[model samples]
Target: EKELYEKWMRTVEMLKAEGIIRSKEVERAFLKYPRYLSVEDKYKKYAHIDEPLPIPAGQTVSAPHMVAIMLEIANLKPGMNILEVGTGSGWNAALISEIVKTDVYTIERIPELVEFAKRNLERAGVKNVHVILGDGSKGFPPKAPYDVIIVTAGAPKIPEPLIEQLKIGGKLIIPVGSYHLWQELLEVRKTKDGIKIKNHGGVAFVPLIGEYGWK
Candidate 1:
């Protein structure tokens, strides 16, 4: 039991050394929800290896470095509301909720993954995250104007609704690029001046599938 936690610590230390983990809050979240908490029982041994692992459905959980980078860039706050475009195995949502210390609404297209996430979140004792089943490309309107909108999949272009759903000062982090090829992790900020965008460099993620996505 202690060994498992030590492994997670070692992985976090590696990311900190590489500057991927830039804040104390983000680091604490990592410790609280080690990747193993989200993995399938068979693959549990590789939980802290810093690589993406297979989850329910045909999706891959975001790698540790990528997850760390996203959390670091979002600059989460304790009272902020977060909208996650992909719930996956509920691990990322767990981490995000821990940092924001507030409500988080996440959308998932696959029903299997929806149930998968619910179970995982329950097991993790997380109570502030709501996982909805639907096409995430359209953005969750009921929870619009989110402080931070994060898309876990790669979209051919930034979904317009995501921009519309973001608060004026909000940040939307998404991967925009080819479906099979690498993508640019874009940091889009909804500002009073209209919209400002910053490219965080290339990354690979599953295709964002829906009305505003690759479909």
Candidate 2:
């Protein structure tokens, strides 16, 4: 445990040095959680490497730097409702739960991953995260109008349902592009006037699969 903790601190130091993680709250979240708990024992040795680590079902626990970027971009705050698409290892949702101090609903297309994430979150004692097995592209309607929505997978375009579910003035962070390999991280805000979009940078993620995603 001590070795893992030291590794996590090193990872945070790198993120800070790279200017990828700015928000203090987001940084604390990364520091507080034990990432190895969300990873399989086989991959536990690589948990603090700051890169994407493989989990079951061919999914990945996103790189720590990428997760920190998304968390900072979302601007998640206390008492805010958040919806996370693609709950790979539940680490992202757990991190959000730590910062938001409110409800977090995450949707996963694969039932296996959903279960894995749920169990992982439970093991971490994260009670505010709700894992739902469904089409992530559709968004979780039971708890719509989220203050922040983050999509961990790469999408062809923004999912319409996600846009509609976002509260006015809310922000969404997603990776969008044409290819399956890489994409541009897009920060979208639903304003009173219209939508505002910004391109953060390039990223690589698994394709988001659903009605509004790649077929």
Candidate 3:
């Protein structure tokens, strides 16, 4: 465990140097939870490569850098309620839970991926993440008014439900565009005045699928 832990921290250090990981809260979460353990044995070989690796259900565990960007961009704070679209392997949710020091509600469209996240989060001894099986593109309404929301997939546009679910002054970071295309990273901030939109630059991910996504 020590050997693998050290190797993962090495990659985290690289991300920090590159400025992908900005805050200490994010760094602490990265250090505490090793990304390698989030994937299966087959992909563990590239766990510390700082790149996205395939998990079961044909979905990809986001790269450490990208996950860091989402977390840092959203400005997650302790005790804040966070809703995550696409639980993936629960790696990102675990990181968010650590930063927020509260429960994270995550939705996954695929049952297999939901099970995968449940087991992975449990195995990692993460107790604050709740993995739900449902279409995350619409956002989880049961736990509405999230202090922050994060969508892991690329969508055609920002879903209206996501904006409605965010608490006032909350920030959302999601990718907009097509897969393997110029998926632009977008940040949406909901304020009393209006919703503020900003393009954080380009990022690529599997296209989002759901009512509010690429139909």
Query: Any residue pairs clashing in model 2, and if so which?
Result: none
**In lDDT terms, how accurate is model 3?**
0.89
lDDT of 2 by residue, 1-215 (tens): 79988888898888888898887898889888868979988988889887899988998999888899899988888999999999999999999999998879999999889999989988888899999988989998899989989999999999999999999999889999999769999999999999999999899999999999999
Off by over 4 Å in 1: none
Whose lDDT is greatest here? 1
lDDT of each: 0.92, 0.91, 0.89
* Better candidate number, 2 or 3, judged by lDDT: 2
lDDT (tens digit, per residue) of candidate 3 on 106-138: 999889999998999988999999999888888
List runs of model 2 lying over 4 Å from the truth: none
Worst lDDT window (10 residues) for model 3? 173-182
Please rank every candidate by lDDT, starting with the best.
1, 2, 3
